């Protein structure tokens, strides 16, 4: 610790959960792909209000293939994370070439939803497939995304 603090354990916590490596993979229940065509009206009924929020036009598409991510209520309590911080780091990685949404911490089911975007206008040749590059992003997502802290650093202990 910084000499300017000694036995303030609440300080030590701040440091621990700003050191400890935390990959998105470590908080993912089940990563699933869907064919959702109508971005306004989602086919899945577990998300009836997400999907009912999203206040666009303030301001002011599209993408055919979905990608979902269920997250555990469990390890949200341990490593300290609000769903938003998650979402933003996801977007921060690809930039403006993927849409992103999420439910609030208060809700019962914590979830993410994404859709590839959006190469048009000045083109070249061979316009096909796309489903293979979709998986390579759910694959890059789990195993190349950082959330908080430095790499090479696993479990971190509060020894006195």
């Amino acid at each position: 610790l910084e000499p300017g603090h000694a036995a303030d354990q609440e300080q030590a916590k701040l440091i621990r959960s700003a050191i400890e490596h935390t990959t998105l993979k470590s908080v993912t229940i089940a990563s699933e792909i869907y064919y959702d065509p109508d971005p306004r009206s989602t086919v899945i009924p577990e998300d009836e209000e997400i999907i009912q929020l999203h206040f666009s036009l303030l301001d002011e598409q599209q993408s055919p293939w979905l990608l979902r991510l269920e997250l555990d209520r469990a390890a949200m309590n341990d490593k300290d994370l609000t769903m938003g911080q998650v979402g933003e780091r996801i977007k921060q990685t690809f930039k403006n070439d993927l849409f992103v949404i999420w439910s609030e911490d208060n809700d019962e089911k914590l979830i993410i939803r994404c859709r590839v975007v959006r190469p048009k206008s000045l083109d070249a040749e061979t316009e096909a497939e796309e489903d293979h590059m979709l998986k390579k992003i759910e694959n890059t997502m789990l195993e190349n995304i950082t959330l908080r802290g430095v790499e090479n650093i696993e479990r971190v202990v509060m020894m006195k």
């Binding site: 993979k25 993912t28 229940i29 089940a30 990563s31 699933e32 792909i33 869907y34 064919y35 959702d36 065509p37 109508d38 086919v43 899945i44 055919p64 555990d72 489903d131 998986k135 759910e138 789990l142």
Partner: protein, 119 residues
């Protein structure tokens, strides 16, 4: 998940978008055959998994000697007869929860007193 196979030539199916009308169509790279879609779920990974837990359970287990037998009660039939064991999902991080199989009813239940279960 569940994906499906074609008749006629019996190979695997590889999904395709219906450009015009917005829907999903499986098909094989063997002949031409195309059926329509079931549930919109195409791919699922899962990293944490609740099945693999109960594996093996038969109608012949209530005779295996190499398995404990304790004083529980069946939520349904009340007979004190049973065997149990810890998740046969031999992963490193799994819980240490007991899985009771009723003899007198072949009903399956758990020790866990928090956490929901749907078998």
């Amino acid at each position: 998940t569940t994906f499906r196979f074609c008749r006629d030539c019996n190979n695997m199916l590889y999904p395709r978008e219906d450009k015009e009308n917005n829907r999903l169509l499986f098909e094989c790279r063997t002949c031409s055959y195309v059926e329509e879609a079931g549930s919109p779920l195409v791919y699922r990974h899962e990293l944490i998994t609740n099945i693999g837990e109960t594996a093996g359970v038969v109608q012949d287990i209530g005779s295996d000697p190499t398995l404990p037998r304790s004083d529980r009660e069946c939520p349904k039939c009340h007979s004190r007869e049973n065997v149990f064991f810890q998740s046969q999902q031999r992963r490193k991080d799994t819980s240490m929860v007991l899985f009771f199989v009723c003899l007198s009813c072949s009903h399956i239940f758990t020790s866990d007193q928090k956490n929901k279960r749907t078998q």
